[model samples]
Target: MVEDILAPGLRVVFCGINPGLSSAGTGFPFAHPANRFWKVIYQAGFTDRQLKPQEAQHLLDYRCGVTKLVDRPTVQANEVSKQELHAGGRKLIEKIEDYQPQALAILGKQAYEQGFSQRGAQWGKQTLTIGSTQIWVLPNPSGLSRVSLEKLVEAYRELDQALVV
Candidate 1:
């Protein structure tokens, strides 16, 4: 029962693959204890301080928002079907068109690949754009991920820098 925190003309929308079980239970995105999302964003300078899941709405103050590729709760992202991902990706394009955020920052590369149908897309910014909205594929900020915290911070910081202009 998680609701997307979104609005028009935002700087960025951080898109997740789906709602994790804990997050769905808490009515928050990235509510799981093991998620590195809040820390990564804070360390990357997107937020002045780390934010708890309950404080997710505070992102709007910074012109950032949160959403999911698919609106289902699962213990792991793999639980979502490819058809669902593709459909969700298409639906996301519609949402982006409606919201008109400056950028869409997908949180997982595999999610981006399957969801957006962009196979072999590299990390960081993507070549695709929806109207004027830039697309970015960032490392998943999950504790289960192999990416180091330093690398996560570095990757996120690059997006943060790009948003400055």
Candidate 2:
């Protein structure tokens, strides 16, 4: 159940599905060897340089934050139940309301759909708003995800604009 609160007053909070074992053990989000979240963020211009798991604090300097829908550690997100996702969504909204970030970017469409009960939500910025936060659904950076790097870059570019503006 290790979680990293990279930034506190972030303009944008990037929520992941949950913590993988590596992340939980290391007390850092996206600690898996193959996860490209840190690399992609740097490449997408949100970070001045690539960050390692140990340097996660840099996210605060970049005005970005990272969290998870479920705080528990699991081998895979599929292990989580629908009830958990729904409950997580409720909790997530509470966090947003309290934190009042400008935007909330969820990392996986499946998790976003289950968590928010928006089965048909598209994979991009949504018209919906959660409290004062804009909502965005971005592709997961897990190596298992088939989305190409180019597509991920484009998606992140859009996220940068939506959050940085």
Candidate 3:
């Protein structure tokens, strides 16, 4: 789909399950207009202003990066297979090792569950670390999800606060 927005030693790397078809077309993560990613991240204090998908590259300026568990673009997250997620997970470990971000915030429950085979993984910070990168699971900001905007902001704000601590 789209290339990762990443750099060495970032404060946080926000990982999504996979890019939507529109995202692939636009070469931007969360390109779908309805996706709450931009708003939620801004509301959570990750950015000084709300950013559009076209402005996603600017996230690196704020010490934040964006990546995906699977490279394939799909209409739905479930379209990604477990095998692909497993492979993606393996590759993600190496990426984390190379980039060494302070935290990795996975955006969806299914992505975290399938990618790392963590069956019962819960919300917020996880005990697992990929080298020095702390892992966190946050609600998906996709418009299709039932999670409210307020709830999404609340979840993401915790990670924002944790980064400062």
Candidate 4:
């Protein structure tokens, strides 16, 4: 199941669809060896330094956190259902309400759309909110996402700008 990696007064709270097998095995969000989440976070300028799994807690220093939509583990995010997305959205909203972050970045278009019921939402800073937190929909950094690293970096940079503001 997905677990929360969060701290109080976070600036950015990143939400993933669900945990893949590798993450489930390691008990870390986006821990799949092929997943570029850590790399992207650093490349996006969210961190002054790169981090390994052991150093994940350091994310709190930059006011960043991680969590997932469904609290279940699966081989692929597509394995999750729409019903679960709805439920997870509710839970996620509650968490955001409690945490009161400045920005909430959902890490995939499909999951963000499904969870928030915003089917037509595009990739980037959306004029949406959960409580008082601004919403940003980022491209999934999964290797299978098809979008190139340059494109992904551009999207993340945009979110980084939002976080800075």
For model 3, residues 76-165, the per-residue Cα lDDT tens digits are: 998899999988999988889989999999998878988899988899989999988999999999999999999999999999999874
48, model 4: CA deviation in Å?
Answer: 1.5
Model 1, residue 162: distance off in Å is: 0.5
Please list the Cα RMSD from the true structure of every candidate, rounded to 1 decimal place.
0.9, 1.5, 0.9, 1.3
Q: Estimate each model's TM-score.
A: 0.97, 0.93, 0.97, 0.95
Model 1, 97-139: lDDT tens digits are 9898999999988899988898789999999999999999999
**Which candidate's lDDT is highest?**
3
Question: Order the candidates by lDDT, highest first — what do you get?
Answer: 3, 1, 4, 2
TM-score for candidate 2: 0.93
Q: Rank by TM-score, descending?
A: 3, 1, 4, 2
Selected candidate, larger lDDT, 3 vs 4 = 3
In candidate 3, which residue pairs get closer than 3 Å at backbone N, Cα or C atoms, i.e. clash?
Answer: none
Would you list the clashing residue pairs of candidate 1?
none
lDDT of 3 at 163: 88
